Coordinates of C-alpha atoms and ligand atoms in Angstrom, one line a residue:
Chain C
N4 CA 0.0 0.0 0.0
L5 CA 2.1 2.9 -1.3
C6 CA 1.5 6.5 -0.5
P7 CA -0.4 8.7 -3.0
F8 CA 2.5 11.1 -3.6
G9 CA 1.7 10.9 -7.3
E10 CA -1.6 12.6 -6.6
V11 CA 0.3 15.7 -5.3
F12 CA 3.5 16.1 -7.3
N13 CA 2.1 14.9 -10.6
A14 CA -1.2 16.8 -10.1
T15 CA -2.4 18.7 -13.2
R16 CA -3.5 21.8 -11.4
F17 CA -1.8 23.5 -8.4
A18 CA -3.5 26.1 -6.2
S19 CA -2.7 29.7 -5.7
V20 CA -0.2 30.2 -2.8
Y21 CA -2.9 32.2 -0.9
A22 CA -5.3 29.3 -0.9
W23 CA -2.6 26.6 -0.5
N24 CA -3.7 23.0 -0.7
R25 CA -3.3 20.3 1.9
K26 CA -3.4 16.5 1.5
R27 CA -3.5 14.1 4.4
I28 CA -1.1 11.2 3.8
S29 CA -1.4 8.4 6.3
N30 CA -1.8 4.6 6.3
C31 CA 0.7 3.9 3.5
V32 CA 4.3 2.8 3.1
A33 CA 6.1 5.8 1.8
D34 CA 9.5 5.6 0.0
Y35 CA 11.2 9.0 0.2
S36 CA 14.4 7.8 -1.5
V37 CA 12.8 8.0 -4.9
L38 CA 12.1 11.7 -4.4
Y39 CA 15.5 12.8 -3.2
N40 CA 17.0 10.9 -6.1
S41 CA 15.2 12.6 -9.0
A42 CA 17.3 15.5 -10.2
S43 CA 14.1 17.0 -11.5
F44 CA 13.8 19.0 -8.3
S45 CA 15.8 22.3 -8.2
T46 CA 15.1 22.7 -4.4
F47 CA 15.1 19.8 -1.9
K48 CA 15.9 21.0 1.6
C49 CA 15.0 19.2 4.8
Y50 CA 14.9 20.6 8.4
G51 CA 15.0 18.6 11.6
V52 CA 15.6 15.4 9.6
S53 CA 18.4 14.3 7.4
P54 CA 17.6 14.1 3.6
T55 CA 19.2 10.7 3.5
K56 CA 17.9 8.2 6.0
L57 CA 14.4 9.6 5.7
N58 CA 12.8 6.1 5.4
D59 CA 14.1 4.9 8.7
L60 CA 11.6 7.2 10.5
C61 CA 7.9 6.8 11.2
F62 CA 5.3 9.6 11.9
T63 CA 1.7 9.8 13.1
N64 CA 0.6 12.1 10.3
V65 CA 2.4 13.4 7.2
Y66 CA 0.8 16.5 5.5
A67 CA 1.6 17.5 1.9
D68 CA 1.1 21.1 1.1
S69 CA 1.2 22.4 -2.5
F70 CA 1.0 25.8 -4.3
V71 CA 2.7 27.9 -7.0
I72 CA 5.0 30.9 -6.6
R73 CA 7.9 32.5 -8.4
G74 CA 11.6 31.4 -8.1
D75 CA 12.6 34.5 -6.3
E76 CA 10.3 33.5 -3.5
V77 CA 11.1 29.8 -2.9
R78 CA 13.7 31.1 -0.5
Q79 CA 10.9 32.3 1.8
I80 CA 9.6 28.7 2.2
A81 CA 11.7 27.8 5.2
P82 CA 11.6 28.3 9.0
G83 CA 12.1 31.9 10.0
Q84 CA 11.8 33.8 6.7
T85 CA 10.1 37.1 6.0
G86 CA 8.6 38.5 2.8
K87 CA 5.2 38.7 1.1
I88 CA 4.9 34.9 1.0
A89 CA 6.1 33.8 4.4
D90 CA 4.2 36.8 5.9
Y91 CA 0.8 36.8 4.3
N92 CA 0.5 33.5 2.5
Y93 CA 2.3 30.4 3.8
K94 CA 4.2 30.4 7.1
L95 CA 6.4 27.5 8.3
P96 CA 7.1 27.5 12.1
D97 CA 10.6 27.9 13.5
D98 CA 10.8 24.3 14.8
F99 CA 9.9 22.9 11.4
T100 CA 10.4 19.1 10.9
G101 CA 10.1 18.2 7.2
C102 CA 11.1 18.8 3.7
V103 CA 10.4 21.7 1.2
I104 CA 10.4 20.4 -2.4
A105 CA 10.1 22.7 -5.4
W106 CA 10.8 22.6 -9.1
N107 CA 10.6 25.0 -12.0
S108 CA 7.3 24.6 -13.9
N109 CA 7.6 27.3 -16.7
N110 CA 6.3 24.8 -19.3
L111 CA 2.9 24.2 -17.5
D112 CA 2.0 27.4 -15.7
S113 CA 3.1 29.9 -18.3
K114 CA 1.1 31.1 -21.4
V115 CA 1.8 33.5 -24.2
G116 CA 0.4 36.7 -22.9
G117 CA 0.7 35.7 -19.2
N118 CA -0.9 33.2 -16.9
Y119 CA -2.9 35.2 -14.2
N120 CA -4.8 32.2 -12.8
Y121 CA -2.3 32.0 -10.0
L122 CA -2.7 34.5 -7.2
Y123 CA -1.1 35.7 -4.0
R124 CA -2.2 37.9 -1.1
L125 CA -0.7 41.4 -1.2
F126 CA -2.2 43.3 1.8
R127 CA -2.8 41.9 5.2
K128 CA -3.1 43.7 8.6
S129 CA -0.9 41.2 10.5
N130 CA 1.4 38.3 9.7
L131 CA 0.2 34.7 9.4
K132 CA 0.6 32.1 12.2
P133 CA 2.5 28.9 11.2
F134 CA 0.2 26.9 8.9
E135 CA -2.5 29.6 8.8
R136 CA -4.5 29.6 5.6
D137 CA -6.3 32.9 4.8
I138 CA -8.7 32.8 1.8
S139 CA -10.5 36.0 2.8
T140 CA -11.2 38.4 -0.1
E141 CA -12.5 41.4 1.9
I142 CA -11.4 44.8 0.7
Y143 CA -8.2 45.8 2.5
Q144 CA -8.9 49.0 4.3
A145 CA -5.6 50.9 4.0
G146 CA -7.1 54.4 4.8
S147 CA -9.0 56.2 7.5
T148 CA -12.3 55.6 5.7
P149 CA -14.4 52.4 5.5
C150 CA -14.5 50.6 2.1
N151 CA -17.9 48.9 2.3
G152 CA -16.8 46.5 -0.5
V153 CA -16.0 49.3 -2.9
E154 CA -12.5 49.4 -4.3
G155 CA -10.9 52.7 -5.0
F156 CA -8.4 54.9 -3.1
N157 CA -7.0 53.3 0.1
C158 CA -9.4 50.4 -0.6
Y159 CA -7.6 47.6 -2.5
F160 CA -8.4 44.0 -3.3
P161 CA -6.0 42.0 -1.1
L162 CA -5.0 39.5 -3.8
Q163 CA -2.6 40.2 -6.7
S164 CA -2.3 38.2 -9.9
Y165 CA 1.2 36.9 -10.6
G166 CA 1.3 37.0 -14.4
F167 CA 4.0 34.4 -15.3
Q168 CA 5.2 35.0 -18.8
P169 CA 7.6 32.6 -20.6
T170 CA 9.8 35.5 -21.6
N171 CA 10.6 36.5 -18.0
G172 CA 13.8 35.9 -16.1
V173 CA 14.1 32.7 -14.1
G174 CA 13.4 34.5 -10.9
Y175 CA 9.9 35.4 -12.0
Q176 CA 9.0 32.1 -13.5
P177 CA 6.3 29.9 -11.9
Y178 CA 7.5 27.2 -9.4
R179 CA 5.5 24.4 -8.0
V180 CA 6.2 23.7 -4.3
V181 CA 5.4 20.7 -2.0
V182 CA 5.9 20.9 1.8
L183 CA 6.1 17.8 3.9
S184 CA 5.1 18.2 7.6
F185 CA 6.2 15.3 9.8
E186 CA 4.4 14.7 13.1
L187 CA 6.5 12.5 15.4
Chain B
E1 CA 21.6 44.4 -9.1
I2 CA 19.4 45.4 -12.1
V3 CA 20.9 48.6 -13.5
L4 CA 18.7 51.1 -15.3
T5 CA 20.3 53.4 -17.9
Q6 CA 18.1 56.2 -19.0
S7 CA 18.9 58.1 -22.1
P8 CA 19.4 60.8 -23.2
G9 CA 20.7 62.7 -20.1
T10 CA 19.0 65.9 -21.1
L11 CA 16.2 66.4 -23.6
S12 CA 15.8 69.8 -25.4
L13 CA 12.3 70.4 -26.8
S14 CA 9.8 73.1 -27.1
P15 CA 6.2 73.2 -25.8
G16 CA 3.9 71.0 -27.9
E17 CA 6.6 68.6 -29.1
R18 CA 6.6 64.8 -28.6
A19 CA 9.1 63.7 -25.9
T20 CA 10.3 60.1 -25.7
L21 CA 12.5 59.0 -22.8
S22 CA 14.4 55.6 -22.8
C23 CA 15.1 53.3 -19.9
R24 CA 17.2 50.2 -20.6
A25 CA 17.9 47.6 -18.0
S26 CA 20.9 45.2 -17.7
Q27 CA 18.8 42.2 -17.1
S28 CA 15.2 41.3 -18.0
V29 CA 12.7 43.2 -15.9
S30 CA 10.1 40.5 -15.4
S31 CA 6.4 41.2 -16.1
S32 CA 6.9 44.9 -17.1
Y33 CA 7.5 45.8 -13.5
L34 CA 8.7 49.4 -14.2
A35 CA 7.6 52.7 -12.8
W36 CA 8.0 56.3 -14.0
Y37 CA 8.4 59.3 -11.7
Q38 CA 8.5 63.0 -12.3
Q39 CA 10.4 65.5 -10.1
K40 CA 9.7 69.1 -10.8
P41 CA 12.4 71.5 -9.5
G42 CA 12.2 71.7 -5.7
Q43 CA 9.5 69.2 -5.2
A44 CA 9.1 65.6 -4.0
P45 CA 8.9 63.0 -6.8
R46 CA 5.5 62.2 -8.2
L47 CA 4.3 58.9 -9.7
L48 CA 3.4 58.9 -13.4
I49 CA 3.3 55.3 -14.7
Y50 CA 3.2 52.1 -12.7
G51 CA 3.6 48.8 -14.6
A52 CA 5.3 50.5 -17.7
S53 CA 1.8 51.4 -19.0
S54 CA -0.8 51.8 -16.3
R55 CA -1.2 55.5 -15.7
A56 CA -1.2 56.7 -12.1
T57 CA -4.2 58.6 -10.5
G58 CA -5.0 62.0 -11.9
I59 CA -2.0 62.0 -14.2
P60 CA -2.8 63.9 -17.4
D61 CA -3.4 61.8 -20.5
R62 CA -0.4 63.0 -22.4
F63 CA 1.8 60.7 -20.3
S64 CA 2.0 57.1 -21.6
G65 CA 4.6 54.4 -21.3
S66 CA 5.4 51.2 -23.1
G67 CA 8.1 48.5 -23.2
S68 CA 8.9 45.0 -22.2
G69 CA 11.9 42.9 -21.1
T70 CA 15.0 45.1 -21.3
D71 CA 13.8 48.3 -23.0
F72 CA 11.1 50.7 -21.7
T73 CA 9.9 54.1 -22.8
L74 CA 8.0 57.0 -21.3
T75 CA 6.4 59.2 -24.0
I76 CA 4.9 62.6 -23.7
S77 CA 2.5 63.3 -26.6
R78 CA 2.2 67.1 -26.4
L79 CA 4.7 68.7 -24.0
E80 CA 3.5 71.4 -21.6
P81 CA 5.4 74.3 -20.0
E82 CA 5.1 72.4 -16.7
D83 CA 6.5 69.1 -18.0
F84 CA 10.1 70.4 -18.0
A85 CA 11.5 68.3 -15.2
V86 CA 13.6 65.2 -14.5
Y87 CA 12.0 61.8 -14.9
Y88 CA 13.1 58.7 -13.0
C89 CA 12.4 55.2 -14.1
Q90 CA 12.3 52.5 -11.4
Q91 CA 12.4 48.7 -11.5
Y92 CA 10.7 46.3 -9.1
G93 CA 10.9 43.0 -10.9
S94 CA 13.8 41.9 -8.6
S95 CA 15.1 43.0 -5.3
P96 CA 16.5 45.4 -4.3
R97 CA 14.5 48.1 -6.1
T98 CA 16.6 50.5 -8.0
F99 CA 16.1 53.8 -9.8
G100 CA 17.6 55.4 -12.9
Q101 CA 19.9 58.4 -12.9
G102 CA 17.2 60.6 -14.4
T103 CA 16.4 62.4 -17.7
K104 CA 16.2 66.2 -17.8
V105 CA 13.6 67.6 -20.2
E106 CA 15.0 71.0 -21.1
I107 CA 13.5 73.9 -23.2
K108 CA 14.9 74.0 -26.7
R109 CA 16.0 77.5 -27.9
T110 CA 18.4 79.0 -30.4
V111 CA 22.1 78.5 -30.0
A112 CA 23.4 81.4 -28.0
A113 CA 27.1 82.3 -27.4
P114 CA 28.2 83.1 -23.9
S115 CA 29.4 86.5 -22.8
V116 CA 32.8 85.8 -21.0
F117 CA 34.2 87.8 -18.1
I118 CA 37.1 87.4 -15.8
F119 CA 37.8 88.9 -12.4
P120 CA 41.2 89.4 -10.7
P121 CA 41.3 88.3 -7.0
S122 CA 40.3 91.2 -4.8
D123 CA 43.2 92.6 -2.8
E124 CA 41.1 92.2 0.3
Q125 CA 41.1 88.5 -0.2
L126 CA 44.8 88.4 -0.9
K127 CA 45.3 89.5 2.7
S128 CA 43.6 86.2 3.7
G129 CA 46.3 84.3 1.9
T130 CA 43.9 82.9 -0.7
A131 CA 43.5 84.0 -4.3
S132 CA 40.2 83.3 -6.0
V133 CA 39.9 84.0 -9.7
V134 CA 36.4 83.9 -11.3
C135 CA 35.5 83.3 -14.9
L136 CA 31.8 84.0 -15.7
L137 CA 29.9 82.7 -18.7
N138 CA 26.7 84.7 -19.1
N139 CA 23.5 83.7 -21.0
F140 CA 24.4 80.9 -23.4
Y141 CA 22.9 77.7 -24.9
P142 CA 23.1 74.7 -25.1
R143 CA 24.3 74.1 -21.6
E144 CA 27.4 72.1 -22.8
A145 CA 30.4 74.4 -22.3
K146 CA 34.0 73.9 -21.3
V147 CA 36.3 76.2 -19.3
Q148 CA 40.1 75.7 -19.1
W149 CA 42.4 77.8 -17.1
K150 CA 45.8 78.8 -18.3
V151 CA 48.4 80.2 -15.8
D152 CA 51.3 81.3 -17.9
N153 CA 50.0 79.0 -20.7
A154 CA 50.0 75.9 -18.4
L155 CA 46.6 74.2 -18.4
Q156 CA 45.4 74.0 -14.8
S157 CA 43.4 71.0 -13.6
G158 CA 42.1 69.9 -10.2
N159 CA 41.9 73.4 -8.6
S160 CA 38.8 74.8 -10.3
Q161 CA 35.1 74.5 -9.4
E162 CA 32.2 75.2 -11.8
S163 CA 28.6 76.1 -10.9
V164 CA 25.7 76.4 -13.4
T165 CA 22.4 78.2 -12.9
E166 CA 19.0 76.8 -14.0
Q167 CA 17.5 77.7 -17.3
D168 CA 16.2 81.3 -17.1
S169 CA 12.4 81.6 -17.1
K170 CA 12.7 84.1 -20.0
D171 CA 15.5 83.6 -22.5
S172 CA 16.0 79.9 -21.4
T173 CA 19.8 80.3 -21.3
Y174 CA 22.4 79.2 -18.8
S175 CA 25.1 81.0 -16.9
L176 CA 28.2 79.4 -15.5
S177 CA 31.0 80.6 -13.1
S178 CA 34.3 78.7 -12.8
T179 CA 36.2 79.6 -9.6
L180 CA 40.0 79.0 -9.7
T181 CA 41.6 78.9 -6.2
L182 CA 45.3 79.3 -5.4
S183 CA 47.3 80.3 -2.4
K184 CA 48.6 83.9 -2.2
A185 CA 52.2 82.5 -2.7
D186 CA 51.5 80.5 -5.8
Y187 CA 49.3 83.3 -7.3
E188 CA 52.2 85.7 -7.1
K189 CA 54.7 83.5 -8.9
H190 CA 52.9 83.8 -12.2
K191 CA 51.8 86.7 -14.5
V192 CA 49.1 85.8 -17.1
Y193 CA 45.9 84.3 -15.8
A194 CA 43.4 83.2 -18.4
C195 CA 40.3 81.2 -19.0
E196 CA 39.4 79.6 -22.4
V197 CA 35.7 79.0 -23.2
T198 CA 34.8 76.4 -25.8
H199 CA 31.1 76.5 -26.6
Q200 CA 29.1 75.3 -29.5
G201 CA 27.9 78.8 -30.2
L202 CA 31.4 80.3 -30.7
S203 CA 33.3 80.0 -34.0
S204 CA 36.7 79.7 -32.3
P205 CA 37.4 79.4 -28.5
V206 CA 37.2 82.7 -26.6
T207 CA 40.1 83.6 -24.2
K208 CA 39.8 86.5 -21.7
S209 CA 42.8 87.0 -19.5
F210 CA 44.5 89.5 -17.2
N211 CA 48.0 90.3 -16.0
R212 CA 48.6 90.1 -12.3
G213 CA 48.4 93.7 -10.8
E214 CA 46.6 95.0 -14.0
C215 CA 49.8 95.4 -16.0
Chain R
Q1 CA -7.0 64.6 3.4
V2 CA -4.1 62.3 2.6
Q3 CA -0.7 63.9 3.5
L4 CA 2.8 63.0 4.5
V5 CA 4.7 65.5 6.6
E6 CA 8.4 64.8 7.5
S7 CA 10.4 66.3 10.4
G8 CA 13.4 65.7 12.5
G9 CA 15.9 66.8 9.9
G10 CA 18.9 68.9 10.7
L11 CA 22.7 69.2 10.9
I12 CA 24.3 66.4 12.8
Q13 CA 27.9 65.5 13.7
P14 CA 29.4 62.5 11.9
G15 CA 29.0 59.3 13.8
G16 CA 26.0 60.7 15.7
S17 CA 22.4 59.7 15.6
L18 CA 19.2 61.3 14.4
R19 CA 15.5 60.3 14.3
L20 CA 13.3 61.4 11.4
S21 CA 9.5 61.5 11.8
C22 CA 6.7 61.2 9.2
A23 CA 3.3 62.4 10.4
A24 CA 0.6 60.8 8.3
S25 CA -2.9 61.9 7.6
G26 CA -5.6 59.8 6.0
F27 CA -3.2 57.0 6.0
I28 CA -2.7 54.3 8.6
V29 CA 0.9 53.4 8.8
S30 CA 0.0 50.1 10.6
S31 CA -1.9 49.2 7.4
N32 CA 0.3 50.2 4.6
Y33 CA 3.8 49.5 3.4
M34 CA 6.0 52.6 4.3
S35 CA 9.4 53.3 2.7
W36 CA 12.1 55.8 3.2
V37 CA 13.7 57.2 0.0
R38 CA 16.7 59.5 0.1
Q39 CA 18.2 61.7 -2.6
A40 CA 21.7 63.1 -2.3
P41 CA 22.3 66.6 -3.6
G42 CA 22.4 66.5 -7.4
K43 CA 22.2 62.7 -7.5
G44 CA 19.2 60.4 -8.1
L45 CA 16.8 58.5 -5.8
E46 CA 17.8 55.7 -3.5
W47 CA 15.6 53.3 -1.6
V48 CA 16.6 53.0 2.1
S49 CA 14.1 51.0 4.2
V50 CA 10.6 49.6 4.1
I51 CA 8.2 48.2 6.8
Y52 CA 5.5 45.8 5.6
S53 CA 2.0 46.4 7.0
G54 CA 2.5 43.2 9.0
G55 CA 5.7 44.3 10.7
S56 CA 8.6 42.9 8.6
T57 CA 11.3 45.3 7.7
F58 CA 14.1 45.5 5.1
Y59 CA 17.0 47.7 4.5
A60 CA 19.3 48.7 1.6
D61 CA 22.8 47.4 2.0
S62 CA 24.4 50.8 2.4
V63 CA 22.4 51.4 5.6
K64 CA 22.1 47.9 6.9
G65 CA 22.9 47.6 10.6
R66 CA 22.9 51.4 10.9
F67 CA 19.3 52.5 10.2
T68 CA 16.2 51.2 11.9
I69 CA 12.6 51.8 10.7
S70 CA 9.6 51.5 13.0
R71 CA 6.2 52.9 13.6
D72 CA 3.9 54.1 16.5
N73 CA 0.4 52.9 15.9
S74 CA -0.8 55.3 18.6
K75 CA 0.4 58.5 16.9
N76 CA 0.1 57.2 13.2
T77 CA 3.7 58.2 12.7
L78 CA 6.6 56.5 10.8
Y79 CA 10.1 56.7 12.3
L80 CA 13.6 56.2 11.0
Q81 CA 16.4 55.9 13.6
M82 CA 19.8 56.7 12.0
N83 CA 23.1 55.8 13.8
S84 CA 26.8 56.0 12.9
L85 CA 25.9 58.6 10.2
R86 CA 28.5 59.6 7.8
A87 CA 28.9 62.2 5.0
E88 CA 27.7 59.8 2.2
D89 CA 24.4 59.7 4.2
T90 CA 23.7 63.4 3.5
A91 CA 20.6 63.8 1.4
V92 CA 16.9 64.7 1.4
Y93 CA 14.9 61.9 3.1
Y94 CA 11.4 61.3 1.7
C95 CA 8.9 59.1 3.5
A96 CA 6.4 57.6 1.1
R97 CA 3.7 55.0 1.1
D98 CA 4.3 52.4 -1.6
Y99 CA 1.8 49.9 -3.1
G100 CA 3.1 46.7 -1.6
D101 CA 6.9 46.7 -1.9
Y102 CA 6.4 47.7 -5.6
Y103 CA 6.2 51.5 -6.5
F104 CA 5.9 54.5 -4.3
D105 CA 2.6 56.2 -5.2
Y106 CA 2.3 58.9 -2.5
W107 CA 5.4 60.9 -1.3
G108 CA 5.9 63.4 1.4
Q109 CA 7.6 66.8 1.2
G110 CA 11.1 65.7 2.2
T111 CA 13.4 66.7 5.1
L112 CA 17.1 67.6 4.6
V113 CA 19.6 65.7 6.7
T114 CA 23.2 67.2 6.6
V115 CA 26.1 65.2 8.1
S116 CA 29.2 67.4 8.4
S117 CA 31.9 68.0 11.0
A118 CA 32.1 71.7 10.2
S119 CA 31.4 74.6 12.6
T120 CA 29.2 77.6 12.0
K121 CA 31.3 80.1 10.1
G122 CA 30.2 83.4 8.6
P123 CA 31.1 84.3 5.0
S124 CA 33.9 86.6 3.8
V125 CA 32.6 88.7 1.0
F126 CA 35.0 89.9 -1.8
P127 CA 34.3 92.2 -4.8
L128 CA 34.5 91.1 -8.4
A129 CA 35.6 94.5 -9.7
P130 CA 34.4 95.3 -13.2
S131 CA 37.6 96.0 -15.1
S132 CA 37.7 98.2 -18.2
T139 CA 27.7 96.2 -21.1
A140 CA 29.9 95.3 -18.1
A141 CA 29.6 92.7 -15.3
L142 CA 30.4 92.8 -11.6
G143 CA 29.6 90.9 -8.5
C144 CA 30.4 89.4 -5.2
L145 CA 32.3 86.3 -4.1
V146 CA 30.7 84.9 -0.9
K147 CA 33.4 82.5 0.3
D148 CA 33.9 80.1 3.3
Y149 CA 30.5 79.9 5.0
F150 CA 28.7 77.0 6.7
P151 CA 25.9 75.9 6.7
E152 CA 23.6 76.9 3.9
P153 CA 21.9 79.0 3.0
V154 CA 23.0 82.6 2.3
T155 CA 20.6 85.0 0.6
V156 CA 22.3 87.5 -1.8
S157 CA 20.5 90.6 -3.0
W158 CA 21.7 93.8 -4.8
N159 CA 21.0 97.4 -3.7
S160 CA 18.5 96.2 -1.1
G161 CA 16.4 94.2 -3.6
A162 CA 16.2 97.3 -5.9
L163 CA 18.4 95.6 -8.5
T164 CA 16.9 92.4 -9.9
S165 CA 17.4 92.4 -13.7
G166 CA 20.4 90.5 -15.0
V167 CA 21.3 89.1 -11.6
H168 CA 22.6 85.5 -11.5
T169 CA 23.2 84.2 -8.0
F170 CA 24.9 80.8 -8.6
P171 CA 24.3 77.8 -6.4
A172 CA 26.6 76.9 -3.5
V173 CA 29.6 74.7 -4.1
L174 CA 30.9 72.7 -1.2
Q175 CA 34.7 73.4 -1.0
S176 CA 37.2 70.7 0.0
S177 CA 37.6 72.4 3.4
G178 CA 33.9 71.5 4.2
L179 CA 32.7 75.1 3.8
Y180 CA 30.5 76.5 1.0
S181 CA 31.4 79.2 -1.5
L182 CA 29.1 81.1 -3.8
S183 CA 29.5 83.8 -6.4
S184 CA 26.9 86.4 -7.4
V185 CA 27.0 88.5 -10.5
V186 CA 24.9 91.2 -12.2
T187 CA 25.4 92.5 -15.8
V188 CA 24.8 96.2 -16.2
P189 CA 25.3 98.9 -18.8
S190 CA 28.9 100.1 -18.7
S191 CA 27.6 103.6 -19.0
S192 CA 26.7 103.7 -15.3
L193 CA 29.9 102.3 -13.8
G194 CA 30.4 105.8 -12.4
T195 CA 26.8 107.0 -12.1
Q196 CA 25.4 104.1 -10.0
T197 CA 26.8 102.4 -6.8
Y198 CA 26.3 98.7 -6.7
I199 CA 26.3 97.1 -3.2
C200 CA 25.5 93.4 -2.6
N201 CA 23.7 92.6 0.6
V202 CA 24.9 89.2 2.0
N203 CA 22.8 87.7 4.7
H204 CA 23.7 84.4 6.5
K205 CA 21.0 83.8 9.1
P206 CA 22.8 80.8 10.9
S207 CA 25.6 83.1 12.1
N208 CA 23.7 86.4 12.4
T209 CA 26.1 87.9 9.8
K210 CA 24.9 90.7 7.5
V211 CA 27.4 92.1 5.1
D212 CA 27.3 95.0 2.6
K213 CA 30.1 95.3 0.1
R214 CA 30.2 98.0 -2.6
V215 CA 31.8 96.9 -5.8
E216 CA 33.3 99.5 -8.1
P217 CA 36.0 99.7 -10.7
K218 CA 39.7 99.5 -9.9
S219 CA 42.6 101.9 -10.7
Ligands
LIG301 C1 5.1 11.4 -12.6 O1 4.9 10.8 -13.8 C2 6.1 10.2 -14.4 C3 5.8 9.6 -15.7 O2 4.8 8.7 -15.6 C4 6.7 9.2 -13.4 O3 7.9 8.6 -13.9 C5 6.9 9.8 -12.0 O4 7.4 8.9 -11.1 C6 5.6 10.5 -11.5 N1 5.8 11.1 -10.2 C7 5.6 10.5 -9.1 C8 5.9 11.4 -7.8 O5 5.2 9.4 -9.0

């Protein structure tokens, strides 16, 4: 009974980082040595556990989180980072035990003209707690006046569209990310 | 580390002409993440274009930018008497955010030759053990001039400071003053003090000098 | 309605500290990104710091470990604590709200911060005698700090006057020439006196400029 990793990494559609997706992976024999030996992954960092020797461990629940962001931002997926992503979208805790996998996906999530389907939260009054998921779309009140659901001046929509274009630099290309949370 | 090189450095045009400013980056600027700012003399910058095309709030329609990748452009369809300022482009497709050096939109006018004048160091200042020679260039255009000092026909370098005024609100000319500074001792070891002015408006370089002590 | 008013600027010794303020109206600093942008004299713009609405802060490399940006939700004011200042820090500091770490869409008025180890010194005024339309003027030399207002014949003479901008001499003091072109027909009919005023030192100078012999 092998774990449904295929249903997460090889998924056809990934979610926007603001509404990141979580899959509960439990009751299955997982082989993590096939992942760390792929070369297709440009980012494979583990914290609290060693990359090698990952199979010699056992956990109560293993969560798989997925979303899309730019390359310039994959550095923010790690314990203790700051920036638009780790602040208002996806926050790892400081005592994080798991692995942060990510790979360039400019051939799937980019389109001629730009792919705006993917979104990220731009304004938020306070930072996220570790593993907080905020899908609220209320107008961000940046001024002294109420907004009452009307955009305008000092009344902005709190989500921004990424707009990945194939002709961009590598730092602003779409990247698919998977985060493994291990509960010992 | 993305470097923005605007060009030209100054732009000479008359009211009602089309103004095009360039802004070229060293590396791709992803997603057309480029802004344009305007800084009238003695004021805080103002936002004109965000996103290389999206016009800011309240900005007049004559402003409009385009461009993608490594080459952007802020265009002014019909220039106004209040659009003669410096324009900064700014990139935010990578951190850290950087600006350009600026493009100055001048007022084009007819070529005008400078009136040259030279002043011996006042005796009062010689008492202070410091000799200041001043070479004035009055009402000229374009602003590109060149002043070389000659003390006994030896070209001086590294002891002169220039200073230019802003384009006059009437004749739209410039005025420049080069200040040569020497010690009382050195000033008195030489005779002929001169300044040579090379300007586009002069047929041949103009040289106005004086002998020490009005000899 | 929406306004940004800076303060706290002034002359400060090198290596010393200084806190700038940015009183905000219509804005809630606790809800916007707030950046400081400085502009050295004659040079271009330069991003200094930013504080995300959530609390995270970032700094340019040239001020990292020396500047600290913060805010007081209770007074709706933005702060910028500068330490170990140096001469290359001299500039006009703007506080501006930016649209999410992207572009700065509303700027303040700017506050000048001068970092210099010079003492208050009044100017020494020297004539530029009109030797034999003529031109004459004054050489205001060796003053600190700016500015010095130069007028001619108590504001009566204003045509053809060209007061040049201050140039910072290598000694750390400012020099500044003023000139006025006039019809050579009056070099003996009219008396030209330039009124130099330097408020920082309570120094008012009058210097008549006339031909030599
Ligand atoms: C994704 O599909 C390829 C091709 O079928 C397969 O080789 C790869 O193992 C799949 N990924 C996972 C995580 O199973």
